[PDB]
């Protein structure tokens, strides 16, 4: 019916009203102290007062760190921007890694603006241009004005345009009998389609037929928009949207990441603060999630040390499964979790714990009931012993071949023999390594 | 056509109970790997789960790529099967993670339902009105069948499709509305006064009778990555062929995911996931593995098949050694299908099948000696020797390869063991690793 | 006959549900407890508003990018509509820098140095370097020896606009590549030719996969004009900026001339076609849908965004084919207006708001809408189903044949508990 991939049995942290975690809630089993710390972090993010707060999720493999970050994102809701990221994303061939890090920092901060739009709309009735007295004079264009007559439901207006709006109108390929949509903030024109007041069965252009827009021609409507700061920076650095030749030639060029200067960021911040002071916009800070943080270089960590001290920084969540490991880009610096000691001071470490046999068994139970499979009790005990013997994940993804082998025998029951066949057909890391050691030519 | 390395494998050779036949469908032997590949094939065909990594491991010349080709041929039509190598990720204009993201998104197909209208009939009158320069174009078309006759209106693209592929009155054309394609089926009027400008010999077709306008429902499969490249910029359809899609932003991918879910929620489109095959996956940086470990956990993720012929070797980007050249985090989230070496009867059957595909009439003793030299040396050498033995055999003008031509081909062309034997006793003739050589013969 | 219909949440409905769940500090247990019991009532009214129809909680409107502009707006026989969009970011420049570095005057040497570096010491000047010009003319084949001095001293955009396909002499060293003589054959070649079809892969891939009927999936979030530069007290800066932003050659090149205006040039004024300012150089978009960033509220998404509404659109076809008279029970008047506009879109026979007399006398009607006395009443649907049996019993015996009662249910919500 649905599609499932390694998650989506997790619906949140599953806490109480006081911050106490239940044993089985939200698809989580165990990890009580980590879930309580994550709930405190969720409350801190929802307070909307702090800047540049960093936590680190430190534990072994298959202990539930990405699951906890997903639960953080699900608990915060879709209004708060969440930016998932791996450590290998920051190495770009178009721009330096520092700019990619700052771009993700500004992408993790949201905004909510209520915008007023001046709108002309209607069905085009009369489209008559007027000519210039000397059109080959070198300066000045061919026409002078274009008269456009629009009609609506209980309304009809005639507009006199300068040529610049008419160039967009002509680029939209409008004619007489079309319903158009002119917005006055940027001069953009949208052509909706043919009016339904004429015949609709004599075309060959697979176009749809709309009726007349209700209300008057000239309106002022309120639109609530959700944007980020990186959208404002990107729109200002590569300007498209005007009707000047720089804007029209900006759309035709191939896009490329540039190094956005700090001056543009300060001016965008000043404009956003002026919008907030007018009661128009509101600020929604969010979370940046960086997975496999040990893949970063020493330069990226050194820039993070300065980027966390800014006054507009979001909450940063990191995760790593490393012990005493040399930092990449250095040769002798041995540090906990592969993170240098200058960053650990600005951090709050949340420690995750390994599981038990019963926790493995019930995690396999929820993963079986999410994938729409039913197993026997003895097969479940075999899977739990198998998960303790080899890995939790190997017991997790052996469920689907067992289900396929159960289906191919015309049964809707997973039994011990299907699990034995799945063992015989698929190996794990330990048995493959044991085959590799006792091999002739790297078998 | 032409003969390839795995041209004899079209399918997997499995029964209705996923049990392999000993010799079927171009595949012989390797029962456990074929059964596991059939299980993975049904896992793909169900389409209910995503982001599962499968590793195929074994010695060289065992049938890993043969297994991948059998899976691809049993997959059937309109299911994406992206086959890449590990060396293609490193590019000068794309990051490794961006190239891996594009390779992931190539393997997810979207099947879009569309509603079209087909129009066929004789053309009565074409009127085309154009500007003085020639930009603005409009006109009317009067098409006609035996029973009905209507007048349509034309646009710029329709007039462009009418002008090229020249249509006159009396020609029979077929128009598809949603594709914008005009095909000329022939001519029926046979106009007498023909200006002798062209050498047209157009076909005589009959009058189409019945309804002028007919509706039909068409289905086409598009990839996800094609939708990102199309929506990325103004001329992305050119970038689909030139490959100039440089580092598509994340906002495009988020909005495309949202619109794909919206199209699924209405019934216009459905998601058909596919198989991404990575041959020589050990030829990858550790940052690629760290990206793969977290890109396998997404909703839009295909089933990934990887092949390795490597033991405990060095992992690239690091300074330690790991099994299969892969880190243990990637090996944690993978199930492993192993492959075992062949017997003499399996090698004989392989050589007989490859001789049947290449159309070579081998003798019995020639087949026995080819099996002997394929069990002492490798299988690919004895497979390569067959065409050379055939080309030697046509020099004597007999269409049957004897053991003499096989012996001549074995004499003329060398194996690896004979090559290292010849090199290791004449080390002065060849260039040393220190760059020293002896050129003079005295 | 009592049967309930189960519906599944849409993407927008689930997004609004998750926003409402995260907004109220996750006291979902209290919401369920006081839902079993029946200012929490105002909290659960938002939830029932979300599962009823997403437009009631927040109306869908025109989806357009955010305009980062400060234009001339109205603080409310023709009306003038002039382009006036600016950027909110202002870059201020002193007059001294402009007047002493960029404009010529008596105390600087902008024009002198420009002439010295561009005319007198240019190596393509035929008055001083005629040998190089003759060498290049033998190399390329240009009929004029001033072509290189003209190419080297004009910008690339001005070069690529006014480029003409002038002829060149055959006695030169520049001949035609193989790729060019392949491409020049198929300029006006028709279909079914072998050379024409072998060089037309892209158009065949365009019409094979139905690329002129696909929909646009991405539009940008913010659109902005270029940053305004302000100099206080100088009209020359304004003139130069207006000339750069609205260059008549370039803006004329990116669009067309009206056809009747071209007729006024060619016939009523005697201007030849070769003297026209050249036009039509803007690239064609992929579809008609890709030509702008503004998306419209369509009356096909309105059906699919509400799951209960889509299940009614699935269910009314059988009742219309079987010829019945349906009646809907509601609780608010907002969805009374919503079903008014939906039924006028679907052109069905319904009431305009005596009712009993019009119900009995007129059988041409189809669907009745009431807000909490019929007999020829066969099929009744409970949209906003509440299991308080006092209202349901009076609704049941308010309205000969077999009677089927229907209830719409949304999976994974309050109503599944209810």
């Amino acid at each position: 019916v649905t599609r499932t991939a390694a998650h989506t049995h997790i619906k949140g942290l599953g806490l109480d009203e006081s911050g106490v975690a239940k044993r089985v809630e939200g698809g989580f089993v165990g990890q009580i102290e980590a879930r309580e710390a994550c709930g405190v972090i969720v409350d801190l993010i929802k307070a909307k007062k702090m800047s540049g707060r960093a936590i680190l999720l430190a534990g072994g493999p298959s202990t539930g760190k990405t699951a906890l970050a997903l639960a953080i994102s699900q608990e915060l809701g879709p209004k708060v921007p969440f930016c998932p990221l791996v450590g290998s994303e920051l190495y770009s061939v178009e721009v330096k890694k520092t700019e990619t890090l700052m771009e993700n920092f500004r992408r993790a901060i949201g905004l909510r603006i209520k915008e007023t739009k001046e709108v002309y709309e209607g069905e085009v009735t009369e489209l008559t241009p007027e000519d210039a007295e000397n059109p080959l004079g070198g300066y000045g264009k061919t026409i002078s004005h274009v008269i456009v007559g629009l009609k609506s439901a209980k309304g009809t207006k005639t507009l006199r345009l300068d040529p610049t709006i008419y160039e967009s109108i002509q680029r939209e390929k409008v004619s007489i009998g079309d319903v158009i949509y002119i917005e006055a903030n940027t001069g953009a024109v949208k052509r909706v389609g043919r009016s339904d007041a004429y015949a609709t069965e004599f075309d060959l252009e697979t176009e749809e037929y709309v009726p007349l827009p209700k209300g008057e021609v000239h309106k002022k409507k309120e639109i609530v928009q959700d944007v980020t700061l990186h959208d404002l920076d990107v729109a200002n650095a590569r300007p498209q949207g005007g009707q000047d030749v720089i804007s029209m030639m900006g759309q035709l060029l191939k896009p490329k990441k540039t190094e956005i200067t700090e001056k543009l960021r300060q001016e965008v911040n000043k404009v956003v603060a002026k919008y907030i002071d007018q009661g128009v916009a509101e600020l929604i800070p969010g979370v940046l999630f960086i997975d496999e943080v040990n893949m970063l270089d020493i330069e990226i960590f050194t820039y993070l040390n300065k980027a966390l001290e800014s006054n507009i920084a979001p909450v940063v969540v990191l995760a790593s499964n490393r012990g005493m490991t040399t930092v990449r880009g250095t040769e002798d610096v041995i540090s906990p979790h592969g993170v240098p000691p200058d960053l650990i001071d600005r951090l709050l470490i949340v420690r995750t714990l390994p599981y038990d046999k019963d926790e493995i068994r019930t995690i396999i139970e929820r993963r079986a009931t999410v994938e729409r499979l039913q197993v026997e009790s003895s097969a479940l005990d075999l899977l739990a012993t198998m998960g303790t013997e080899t890995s939790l994940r190997y017991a997790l993804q052996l469920l689907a071949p067992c289900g396929i082998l159960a289906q191919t025998s015309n049964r809707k029951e997973i039994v011990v023999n299907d699990v034995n066949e799945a063992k015989l057909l698929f190996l794990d890391a330990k048995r493959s390594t044991k085959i590799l050691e006792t091999s002739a030519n790297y078998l | 056509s032409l003969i390839a390395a795995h041209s004899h494998i079209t399918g997997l050779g499995l029964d209705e109970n996923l049990q392999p036949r000993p010799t079927s469908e171009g595949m012989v032997g390797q029962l456990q790997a074929r059964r596991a590949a059939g299980v993975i094939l049904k896992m793909v065909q169900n389409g209910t789960i995503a982001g599962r990594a499968v590793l195929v491991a074994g010695p060289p010349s065992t049938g890993k790529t043969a297994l991948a080709m059998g899976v691809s041929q049993s997959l059937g039509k309109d299911v994406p099967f992206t086959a890449i190598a590990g060396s293609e990720i490193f590019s000068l204009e794309l990051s490794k993670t961006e190239a891996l993201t594009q390779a992931f998104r190539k393997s997810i197909g979207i099947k879009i339902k569309e509603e079209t209208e087909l129009i066929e009939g004789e053309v009565v009158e074409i009127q085309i009105d154009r500007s003085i320069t020639g930009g603005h174009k409009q006109g009317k078309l009067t098409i006609k069948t035996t029973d009905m006759e209507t007048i349509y209106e034309l646009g710029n693209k329709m007039i462009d499709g009418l002008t090229k592929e020249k249509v006159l009155a009396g020609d029979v054309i077929s128009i598809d509305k949603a594709s914008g394609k005009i095909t000329k089926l022939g001519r029926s009027f046979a106009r007498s006064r023909d200006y002798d400008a062209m050498g047209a010999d157009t076909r005589f077709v009959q009058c189409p009778e019945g309804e002028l306008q007919k509706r039909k429902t068409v289905v086409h499969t598009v990839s996800l990555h094609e939708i990102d490249v199309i929506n990325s910029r103004t001329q992305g359809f050119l970038a689909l062929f030139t490959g100039d899609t440089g580092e598509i932003r994340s906002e495009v991918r988020d909005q495309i995911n949202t619109k794909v879910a919206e199209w699924k929620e209405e019934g216009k489109a459905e998601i058909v996931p596919g198989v991404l095959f990575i041959d020589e996956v050990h030829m990858l940086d550790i940052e690629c593995f760290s990206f793969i470990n977290r890109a396998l956990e997404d909703e839009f993720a295909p089933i990934v098949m990887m092949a390795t012929n490597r033991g405990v070797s060095k992992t690239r980007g690091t300074n330690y050694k790991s099994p299969h050249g892969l880190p243990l985090d990637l090996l944690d989230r993978s199930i492993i299908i192993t492959t075992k070496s062949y017997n003499e009867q399996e090698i004989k059957t392989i050589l007989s099948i490859r001789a049947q595909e290449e159309e070579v009439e081998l003798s019995s003793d020639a087949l026995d000696l080819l099996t002997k030299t394929g069990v002492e040396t490798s299988l690919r050498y004895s497979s390569n020797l067959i065409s050379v033995a055939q080309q030697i055999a046509m020099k004597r003008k007999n269409n049957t390869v004897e053991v003499e031509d096989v012996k001549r081909a074995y004499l003329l062309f060398l194996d690896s063991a004979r090559s290292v034997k010849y090199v290791q006793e004449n080390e002065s003739q060849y260039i040393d690793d220190q760059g020293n050589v002896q050129i003079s013969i005295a | 006959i009592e049967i309930d219909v189960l519906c599944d949440l849409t993407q927008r409905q689930a997004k609004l549900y998750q926003v409402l769940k995260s907004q109220i500090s996750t006291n979902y247990d209290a919401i369920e407890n006081a839902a079993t019991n029946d200012n929490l009532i105002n909290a659960v009214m938002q939830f029932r508003k979300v599962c009823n129809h997403p437009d009631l909680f927040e109306r869908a409107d025109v989806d357009s990018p955010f305009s980062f502009t400060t234009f001339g707006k109205t603080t409310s026989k023709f009306t003038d509509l002039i382009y006036s969009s600016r950027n909110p970011i202002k870059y201020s420049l002193p007059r001294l820098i402009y007047e002493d570095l960029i404009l010529p005057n008596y105390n600087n040497d902008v024009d002198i140095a420009n002439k010295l570096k561009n005319v007198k010491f240019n190596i393509f000047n035929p008055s001083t370097n005629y040998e190089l010009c003759l060498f290049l003319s033998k190399l390329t084949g240009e009929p004029s020896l001033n072509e290189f001095f003209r190419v080297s001293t004009t910008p690339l955009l001005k070069r690529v606009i006014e480029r003409t396909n002038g002829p060149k002499n055959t006695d030169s060293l520049s001949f035609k590549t193989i790729t060019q003589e392949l491409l020049e054959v198929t300029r006006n070649a028709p279909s079914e030719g072998v050379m024409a079809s072998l060089l037309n892969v892209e158009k065949h891939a365009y019409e094979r996969e139905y690329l002129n009927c696909i929909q646009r999936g991405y539009h940008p979030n913010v659109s902005a004009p270029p940053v305004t530069i302000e100099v206080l007290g100088s009209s020359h800066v304004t003139n130069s900026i207006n000339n750069e932003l609205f260059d008549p050659l370039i803006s004329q090149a990116l669009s067309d001339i009206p056809a009747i205006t071209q007729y006024n040039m060619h016939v009523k004024k005697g201007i030849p076609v070769e003297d026209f300012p050249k036009t039509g150089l803007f690239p064609e978009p992929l579809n008609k849908n890709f030509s702008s960033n503004i998306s419209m509220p369509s009356m096909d998404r309105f059906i699919t965004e509400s799951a209960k509404l889509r299940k009614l659109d699935e269910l009314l076809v059988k009742l219309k084919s079987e010829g019945h008279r349906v009646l809907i029970y509601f609780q608010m008047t907002k969805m009374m207006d919503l079903m008014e506009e939906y039924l006028t879109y679907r052109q069905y026979n319904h009431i305009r708001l005596d009712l009993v007399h019009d119900w009995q006398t007129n059988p041409e009607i189809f669907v009745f809408l009431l807000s909490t006395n019929l007999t020829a009443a066969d099929t009744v649907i409970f949209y906003d189903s509440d299991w308080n049996p006092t209202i349901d019993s009076q609704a049941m015996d308010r309205a000969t044949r077999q009677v089927t009662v229907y209830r719409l249910l949304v999976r994974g919500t309050i109503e599944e508990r209810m």
Partner: peptide, 28 residues
């Protein structure tokens, strides 16, 4: 009733007529 057709608006523009017996081309 029958809906009217869309108005056709071609002044100052050329014309190519392609009939059964004979073809035109009107120029300015």
């Amino acid at each position: 009733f029958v809906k009217p057709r869309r108005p056709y608006n071609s002044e100052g523009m050329t014309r190519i007529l392609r009939r059964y017996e004979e073809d035109l081309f009107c120029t300015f």
